[PDB]
Write a protein that binds this ligand. Structure first.
Ligand SMILES: Nc1nc2c(ncn2[C@@H]2O[C@H](COP(=O)(O)O)[C@@H](O)[C@H]2O)c(=O)[nH]1
Ligand SMILES: Nc1nc2c(ncn2[C@@H]2O[C@H](COP(=O)(O)O)[C@@H](O)[C@H]2O)c(=O)[nH]1
Ligand SMILES: Nc1nc2c(ncn2[C@@H]2O[C@H](COP(=O)(O)O)[C@@H](O)[C@H]2O)c(=O)[nH]1
Ligand SMILES: Nc1nc2c(ncn2[C@@H]2O[C@H](COP(=O)(O)O)[C@@H](O)[C@H]2O)c(=O)[nH]1
Ligand code: NA
Ligand code: NA
Ligand SMILES: [Zn+2]
Ligand SMILES: [Zn+2]
Lengths: 430, 429
């Protein structure tokens, strides 16, 4: 009917938190319902490992790390996550001849440094790490099934292409669900390659159609489908990937399983722009995660991303201009934990009075209110900027209470623990 | 002819389908908060005249576990109050035998009690309410009970709860939880709200004369001032259910003139040593400090994790009961040793990360165990079965790490989940 349709999961038997997430399939905020129980099957597109990672990559993976911590630590969902490592790619192939070291040896180098940068930022590793080099055989069988479903064709040179026209014809299949308006050997220019016949002096793999490499998009559909299956609760990535990469993943997986909805919720992180231009290796405006870590700490970098809503675009000001606010917040969190611990330590039950005073009750009321504010923020599509503000306000009032008033030791311990619980959800470490 | 219980409405509340053994209904009922996800919780505290023993440990560690389940696992919001009974006949007697002040004795054993609690990793409550600091509030509480014509004053200057006037009212039933357990008095079963003090005994000025608060009035006063007319949870040991807890309900119902002061009354079962309750008087008791020179806090918490909070349990001394606990503590320790070392020393550069069938089978048992434990916690805090679920999962993880090629991310997830459950249990590794 010229409009793509979206089927919300049924609510019976599912964990309902009334969480709302910005879903790129509906281009709106919708209630999140698991496919099965409280389980969330989640695939996230990974890096292409030919170079150092930069602050833009940090934005995406730290942002979805925070969302993952919110889902699992805060809401107690059960998340099964997969991230691919794209270790075969044209950029890796070209760089390996420039570097005069093996392609595989170059790919491990930058995958290792990528995971070390993620660990440095306190990013949790996914459940499964799926490398393209280890899945080429699975990829080929995936392409075969797409061909048997008559949604792909083979060129004489030995490449394989996705037949978009055959895909559209089916009433159950719509091409480019998320960006409908973004649309030689080929039937049509809009067809894309699943298998590429191998260029000379290029790494290659055996296949029924000839020596070749996987195409850009087939890696993700194959790996995600083998481990997670015919329905994905969440698929994530940066916004630039929405078309053509993610829409093509949907086309390949729908073609493979012959069904209409491979993914219930598609989440796209907004881009990090430096001076109004996206941070890209090509532009030469980029800042490596390692350089960033020599001036600033993991907490400060995470606070930078906490201050910017995950699905919005953000602008980083270099020379620490944007980092000035972050350093202030990290400095005050550190000082807070210092004080409240000294006051808990020096508290003496025998000499203090433990009457529940009016000052105590006022702080307690603010403490329970702040718990409910933060809960609404997380339900409001992971509004970490406002949740972080709630904690700062609560800390300002705790500082006043501790300085003057007589302190209820138990109340202060409870508040320290809640703030610890929220900071663990953020990935901050104090 | 039987008291009725009104379940809170589910509308607007956090509903977990949790079921708790409620002494008011003498059955298992679904737990519904009074307001949203908030739980107002009052727990009867110790009388600070002596060292705490393993029985006190059973009650407070068991309800610490329940509190951790409620807050850490289910993400409820718990506002808790515990009284310290620092004025009491037992404190007065002990203070004269030792020839020390009533307050100096109470502070000493209050301090050792909180130190014993910290040693067992028992979380402190939000508010600690001492009777000596609330004597004025207690008096004003008794006044309102008298104005509602549910209490009367004797010639000596004492005040007594008029049970018969309380029963007459249709909105009030006396002794809801133990209905069959029922001189100056109108009736012998009336109990004192205010006791006229002998001149030597410590006392406080009051409208009816110098006196002390009675046994039960302290708790109704303090819980009502901080938490109010409705208590989501009131907890204590089983022997306290009558007359102490039933009298708390009568006093609070009389004060507020309503029918239900507490939605859910949870009573931990008693710890018996050689078939008799651990009591200072019997001389069968084991202090928490003595216990901690023989066994560790984790081992002691595992003992109470193995015994369901609301059931009676028998401790066999000379380490008979503790042998099982020490084995479990040993196996948790060794499991964490391996999984932590393999996570640290895992090297992404040299490893193969294909999602193998062994990886998929461990993952399936891992998610299955999450659902088993979830059902156990909903089943009235069945920590013994949740603990067994963890043990089963740990046996299979040990095999996986020893033999299979390990998915570093999957092992991190399992390490994180088991830590999350151990924090809910209060274990520290
Ligand atoms: N990307 C995409 N565009 C489609 C599809 N079907 C129709 N359209 C677009 O929608 C317009 C309406 O044509 P119809 O929907 O009747 O085929 C066409 O001009 C075509 O560009 C489809 O499956 N995928
Ligand atoms: N936020 C943000 N994400 C980026 C940027 N550049 C790449 N990404 C994201 O980082 C992930 C991996 O990056 P890749 O290595 O594919 O360039 C992708 O999901 C992509 O969307 C950037 O400048 N900002
Ligand atoms: N425990 C208890 N028993 C009551 C109450 N009201 C009446 N009863 C019992 O019910 C029986 C019937 O007496 P009535 O209900 O006429 O007072 C009495 O023998 C009395 O024991 C009450 O509030 N509490
Ligand atoms: N499980 C258990 N609890 C006890 C024992 N003795 C006292 N308690 C509990 O410990 C708490 C404080 O005891 P108290 O200081 O009032 O003697 C009360 O809630 C009481 O129920 C015992 O032998 N076993
Ligand atoms: Na794009
Ligand atoms: Na009793
Ligand atoms: Zn991808
Ligand atoms: Zn009490």
């Amino acid at each position: 009917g010229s409009l793509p349709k979206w089927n919300q999961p049924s609510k019976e038997g599912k964990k309902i938190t009334n969480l709302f997430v910005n879903n790129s399939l509906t281009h709106s905020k919708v209630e999140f319902i698991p496919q099965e129980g409280n389980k969330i099957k989640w695939y996230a597109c990974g890096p292409t490992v030919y170079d150092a990672a930069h602050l833009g990559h940090a934005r995406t993976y730290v942002s979805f790390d925070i969302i993952r911590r919110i889902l699992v630590n805060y809401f107690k969902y059960d998340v099964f996550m997969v991230i691919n490592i794209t270790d075969i790619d044209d950029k890796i192939i070209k760089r390996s001849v420039e570097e005069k070291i093996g392609f595989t040896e170059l790919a491990r180098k930058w995958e290792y440094e990528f995971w070390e940068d993620m660990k440095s930022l306190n990013v949790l590793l996914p459940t499964a790490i799926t490398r393209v080099s280890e899945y080429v055989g699975d990829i080929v069988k995936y392409i075969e099934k797409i061909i048997e479903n008559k949604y792909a064709y083979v060129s004489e040179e030995g490449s394989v292409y996705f037949d978009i026209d055959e895909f559209k014809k089916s009433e159950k299949h719509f091409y480019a669900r998320m960006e409908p308006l973004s649309v030689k050997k080929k039937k049509n220019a809009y067809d894309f390659a699943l298998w590429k016949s191998s260029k000379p002096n290029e790494p290659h793999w055996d296949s029924p159609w000839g020596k070749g490499r996987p195409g850009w998009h087939i890696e993700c559909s194959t790996m995600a489908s083998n481990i997670l299956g015919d329905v994905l609760d969440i698929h994530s990535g940066g916004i630039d990937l929405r078309f053509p990469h993610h829409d093509n993943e949907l086309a390949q997986s729908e073609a493979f399983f012959d069904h209409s909805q491979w993914v219930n919720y598609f989440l796209h992180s907004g881009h990090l722009h430096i001076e109004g231009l996206k941070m890209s290796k090509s532009l030469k405006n980029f800042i490596t995660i390692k350089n960033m870590l020599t001036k600033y700490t993991s907490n400060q970098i995470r606070i930078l991303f906490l201050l910017n809503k995950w699905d919005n675009f953000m602008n980083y000001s270099p020379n620490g201009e944007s980092m000035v606010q972050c350093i202030e917040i990290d400095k005050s969190f550190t000082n807070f934990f210092a004080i409240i611990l000294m006051k808990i330590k020096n508290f003496d039950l025998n000499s203090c009075n433990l009457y529940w005073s009016d000052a105590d009750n006022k702080l307690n009321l603010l403490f329970r209110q702040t718990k409910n504010k933060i809960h609404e923020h997380f339900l409001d599509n992971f509004n970490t900027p406002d949740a972080l503000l709630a904690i700062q306000k609560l800390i300002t009032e705790i500082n006043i209470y501790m300085d003057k008033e007589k302190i209820q030791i138990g109340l202060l311990l409870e508040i320290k623990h809640y703030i610890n619980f929220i900071f663990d959800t953020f990935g901050l470490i104090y």
